[PDB]
Amino acid sequence: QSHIIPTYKRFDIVLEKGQGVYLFDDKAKKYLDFSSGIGVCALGYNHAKFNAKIKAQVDKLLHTSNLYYNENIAAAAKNLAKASALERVFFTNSGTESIEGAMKTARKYAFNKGVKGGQFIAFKHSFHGRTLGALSLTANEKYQKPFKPLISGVKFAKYNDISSVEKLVNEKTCAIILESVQGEGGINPANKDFYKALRKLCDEKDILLIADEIQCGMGRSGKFFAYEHAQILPDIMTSAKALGCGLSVGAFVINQKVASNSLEAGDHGSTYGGNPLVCAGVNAVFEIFKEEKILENVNKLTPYLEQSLDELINEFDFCKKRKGLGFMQGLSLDKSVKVAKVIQKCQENALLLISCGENDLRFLPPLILQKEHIDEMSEKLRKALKSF
* Footprint on residues 94-113 left by a copy of itself (CB under 8 A): 94, 96-97, 100-101, 103-105, 107-108, 111-112
Beta-carbon contacts of residue 132 (< 8 Å; ≥ 6 apart): 147, 150, 151
Closest separation between CB of residue 62 and a copy of itself, Å?
Answer: 3
Q: Which of 136, 100, 103 is nearest to 117 (CA)?
A: 103
Cα distance between residue 90 and residue 254, in whole Å: 8
- Compare residues 331 and 352 and give the one whose CB is closer to a copy of itself: 352
Q: What's the closest the beta carbon of residue 160 comes to Mg ion, in angstroms?
A: 5
Name the residue nearer to Mg ion (CB basis): 113 or 167.
167
335, amino acid identity: K
Backbone angles phi and psi of 362, in degrees to 5: -120, 135
Segment lying near Mg ion (by CB under 5 A), choices 59-67, 84-92, 336-344, 363-371: 363-371
Is 360 annotated as belonging to a binding site? no
Pick the closer one to Mg ion by CB: 111 or 304: 304
Site map for a copy of itself, 4-23, x if CB under 8 A? xxxx-xxxxxxxxxx----x
SS3 (DSSP) at 34: coil
Work out whether 165 is an interface residue with Mg ion (CB under 5 A): no
The residue among 341 and 371 lying less far from Mg ion, judged by its C-beta, is 371
Closest CA to 373 of 50, 30, 47, 52: 30
Query: If contact means CB under 5 to 8 A according to the sort of partner, which of a copy of itself, Mg ion, none does residue 16 touch?
Result: a copy of itself
For the CB of residue 307, give the shortest distance to a copy of itself in the complex, in Å. 28
Question: Which of 48, 35, 20, 38 shows the shortest CA–CA distance to 284?
Answer: 48
Gap between the Cα atoms of 300 and 10, Å rounded: 33
Q: Is 303 in the site for a copy of itself (CB under 8 A)?
A: no
Asked whether position 319 contacts Mg ion by CB under 5 A, the answer is yes
Stretch of 52-60, 77-85, 199-207, 371-379 contacting a copy of itself, by CB under 8 A: 52-60
**Nearest distance from C-beta of residue 188 to Mg ion, angstroms:** 12
CA dihedral 128, 129, 133, 137 (to 10 degrees): 30
Residue 194 binds Mg ion (CB under 5 A): yes
DSSP assignment string, 155-184: EEE-TT-HHHHHTT--TTEEEEEEESEE-T
Tell me whether strands 236-239 and 250-254 are parallel, antiparallel or unpaired. antiparallel
Q: Is 70 in the site for a copy of itself (CB under 8 A)?
A: yes
Say whether residue 280 binds a copy of itself (CB under 8 A). no
